[PDB]
Amino acid sequence: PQVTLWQRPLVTIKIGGQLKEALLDTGADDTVLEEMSLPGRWKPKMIGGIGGFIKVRQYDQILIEICGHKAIGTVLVGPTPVNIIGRNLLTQIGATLNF
Amino acid sequence: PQVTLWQRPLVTIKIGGQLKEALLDTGADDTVLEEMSLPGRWKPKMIGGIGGFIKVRQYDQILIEICGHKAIGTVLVGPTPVNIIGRNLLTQIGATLNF
Numbered sequence: 001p002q003v004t005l006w007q008r009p010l011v012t013i014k015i016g017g018q019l020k021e022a023l024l025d026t027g028a029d030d031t032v033l034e035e036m037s038l039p040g041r042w043k044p045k046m047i048g049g050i051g052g053f054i055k056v057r058q059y060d061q062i063l064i065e066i067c068g069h070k071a072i073g074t075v076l077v078g079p080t081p082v083n084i085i086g087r088n089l090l091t092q093i094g095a096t097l098n099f
Numbered sequence: 100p101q102v103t104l105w106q107r108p109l110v111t112i113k114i115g116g117q118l119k120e121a122l123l124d125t126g127a128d129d130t131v132l133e134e135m136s137l138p139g140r141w142k143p144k145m146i147g148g149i150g151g152f153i154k155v156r157q158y159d160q161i162l163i164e165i166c167g168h169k170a171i172g173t174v175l176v177g178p179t180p181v182n183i184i185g186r187n188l189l190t191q192i193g194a195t196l197n198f
């Protein structure tokens with residue numbers, strides 16, 4: 001799907017048996033999800049934001065289905081106001097920016 | 100051009116007779132630049148974020164040259180660890196996300 005940017009690019013994702021809506025964010029290095037329940041297995045970390053620093057938990061090897069595609073990797077889970085799919089997963093989904 | 104996402108989608112921008120580098124960011128509604136010498140007047144504003152809040156100066160009808168493309172719009176100036184090109188401009192240079 002070619003996604004024009006007049007509207008926020010939102011996609012449906014499935015994680016840990018749950019359905020969410022997430023943002024395709026080319027500016028994000030990692031993926032960060034709003035507080036959710038996960039089986040695991042997790043490490044802490046604080047990240048960079050605008051503005052401020054947020055402590056997040058690091059879950060690696062998480063299966064994510066994004067718009068239909070299966071992808072595995074590390075997702076941070078923190079106090080985000082929105083679900084963000086950063087480059088770590090975008091690359092697996094074979095996503096691209098065109099202009 | 101076509102950009103893959105293995106690395107940060109950084110582009111060269113000319114703004115106010117100054118050359119900078121910015122991050123194409125599909126997840127940013129607006130464009131937010133680090134602090135710089137911008138002529139003209141601006142209105143105060145506050146953008147939301149992750150674990151914080153940055154008060155920025157809103158400037159409008161500002162000429163921005165992204166890659167070779169020229170665009171005019173609202174640019175937010177403020178304290179950001181990165182220069183971000185948001186959808187308000189992305190839309191103007193015709194960028195599409197594809198996956």
Ligand SMILES: N#CN=C1N(Cc2ccc(CO)cc2)[C@H](Cc2ccccc2)[C@H](O)[C@@H](O)[C@@H](Cc2ccccc2)N1Cc1ccc(CO)cc1
Pocket residue numbers: 025026027028029030031032047048049050051081082084086124125126127128129131146147148149180181183
């Ligand atoms: N804040 C923040 N946080 C943000 N912003 C700014 C941002 C936010 C909002 C606007 C306009 O309202 C403009 C810019 C938006 C996130 C977002 C989007 C909408 C609403 C809330 C949060 C962007 O979509 C998102 O790509 C980045 C932008 C950014 C990148 C690098 C350094 C600093 C910032 N980010 C922090 C971030 C970094 C790293 C990871 C993973 O490694 C996830 C998230």
